[PDB]
Amino acid sequence: GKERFVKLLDQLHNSLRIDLSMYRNNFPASSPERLQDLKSTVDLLTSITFFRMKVQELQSPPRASQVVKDCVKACLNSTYEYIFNNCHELYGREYQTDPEQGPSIKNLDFWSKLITLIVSIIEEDKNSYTPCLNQFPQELNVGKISAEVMWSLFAQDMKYAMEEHDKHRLCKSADYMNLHFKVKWLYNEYVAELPTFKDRVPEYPAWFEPFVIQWLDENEEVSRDFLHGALERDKKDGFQQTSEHALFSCSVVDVFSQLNQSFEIIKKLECPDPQIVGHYMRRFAKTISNVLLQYADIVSKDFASYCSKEKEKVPCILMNNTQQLRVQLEKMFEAMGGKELDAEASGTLKELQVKLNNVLDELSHVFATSFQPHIEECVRQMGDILSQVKGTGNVPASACSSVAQDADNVLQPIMDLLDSNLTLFAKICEKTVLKRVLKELWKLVMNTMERTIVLPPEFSKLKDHMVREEAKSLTPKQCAVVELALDTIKQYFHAGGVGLKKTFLEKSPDLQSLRYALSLYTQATDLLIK
């Protein structure tokens, strides 16, 4: 009786389920009349379900929104199987231009085509079928289900496929790189904002992690080969400063223009896994180091070759270049996250900022020592003039030379250095660089003077062992001329305020070593009670 009726409904409910489990094939989006029949088919199913929820007062858990939902998922699983098995013909028929068959290990084309066909499905379920099945908007969004199912099926195939390529690597890294990019767009466009995924971090970046580390390895080798040819193009050019305001040559902007391009690649992927992005940054910090350290190692190898009077601007530029590495690195360090950057990556660059700074010191030391022969010749030449200083006002001569005049005559040999160069340096030197070069020339002058004009007394066998002889005192005038000459040298390094701060010159231990040396010869005018 009524048992013949319940079996009748089950068979009809079942028959409609079968029809909806292939809705895409049974109700093509091409036909508006057929999409209406789909709408009608879902209407008839809800009415049956609704009737059973009421009259069949027994519990009827088959809520209509879930039955349709599960029918849609079935069709999607079928759809994915169809496009997966006909990826080539479907793509070439529509998304074509000029001209095994599924997943290949020699090639990735199949996957870029599949992603295109997947989007076509999702877009179709969004534009065509979601407006059609508007019976339960709060619980049935075909387009959102399409994105979820199609991604999930695609994801588990892609996962396995990349595990296979990881153990083979028969394709260009550029191909794995472009695929990672196309997958990103797919995920962020259709999946990222879904409830199932709008929470935890995706897993797709891990599929490609080994392939970018390979691209980063290959990328570092391309950066080395670019560095070398970037300096030779600048060496043959003569290290011309790029502009009157730019104190560095063209090879510096070339190296950092590339290193940024390479970094930009890793950013277009918008890797959403912080553990993985930290891994990429860790590796690229190693590239930045080896590259920049190579830049620094190339100049040190050739820096002395440029230390001479002929080209004295060029050695100054190479120091400006080395300093420029220190600052544009910092600008790069910030681009990579600053303090947000991975610790190991941040430590690789700060440890590089140090080694780079130590190179600048070694370079300035080599540049100051490039003058040591000329300085020693200037200091023995001013020591001879000091020895010719003597009081002459004994007789009404009037033509006697004052202490002030004599100090100028003593400094004049070394003045050809200050005016001709220390006005050329500050003209073509980074502030930081100039400060380093002068601090080095300063040391060399105070050192040379402490060895030349002082003429420290020698050892000789006195009685039964070696004793140092008494110092030959300078005459009172000579004392006054030395001290004034020395104070003048200090002022010229101060250069009002352009050079070294008076606080450092006074505390300089090379000045204290010279002042103590003089004190042996300055007994005539030194005060007992200061």
Residue numbers in the entry: 942 to 1040, 1050 to 1480
Source paper text:
Munc13–1 acts as a master regulator of neurotransmitter release, playing a crucial role in release itself and multiple functions in integrating the effects of diverse signals that alter release probability during presynaptic plasticity. Thus, neurotransmitter release is completely abrogated in the absence of Munc13s. This phenotype most likely arises because Munc13s play key roles in docking and priming that are associated at least in part to their activity in opening syntaxin-1 and thus stimulating SNARE complex formation through their MUN domain. However, the C1-C2B region and the C-terminal C2C domain are also critical for release, which may arise because these domains help bridge the vesicle and plasma membranes.
The structure of C1C2BMUN can be viewed as a highly elongated rod spanning ca. 195 Å and is formed mostly of α-helical bundles, with a total of 26 helices; the C1 and C2B domains pack at the N-terminal end of the rod. Much of the long rod is formed by the MUN domain, which is homologous to subunits of complexes that mediate tethering in diverse membrane compartments and was previously shown to be formed by four subdomains of about five helices each (named A-D and colored in blue, green, yellow and orange on Figure 1). Comparison of our C1C2BMUN structure with the crystal structure of the almost complete MUN domain (with the N-terminus at residue 933), which was described in Yang et al. (2015) and we re-refined, shows that the MUN domain is very similar in both structures, as expected because this structure was used in crystallographic phase determination by the molecular replacement method. Note in this context that the similarity in the structures of the two molecules from the asymmetric unit of the C1C2BMUN crystals and between these structures and that of the nearly complete MUN domain suggest that the overall architecture of C1C2BMUN has limited flexibility.
